[PDB]
Amino acid sequence: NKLDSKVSGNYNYLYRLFRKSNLKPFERDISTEIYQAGNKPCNGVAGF
């Protein structure tokens, strides 16, 4: 709490809220593609 906290907040740290499938053990994904939950294609931009 004395190193990884900022009053402004720390954005240098990120987590993956949504992924299509659960990761296999000891697997690391560094992809920054859009999670296409919807049938309609996000096509690199946010949407419904």
């Binding site: 296999k24 053990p25 000891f26 560094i30």
Partner: protein, 37 residues
């Protein structure tokens, strides 16, 4: 020789670099690749 040439164009967030002794009339060379855990 043209070295790496057209094998790759760019490298992003490269996290690994193992360099060791090279892996490789006819010579049979057999390899088995497994990706487990």
């Amino acid at each position: 020789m043209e070295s790496e040439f057209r094998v790759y164009s760019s490298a992003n967030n490269c996290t690994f670099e193992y360099v060791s002794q090279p892996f490789l009339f006819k010579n049979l060379r057999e390899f088995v690749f497994k990706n487990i855990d």
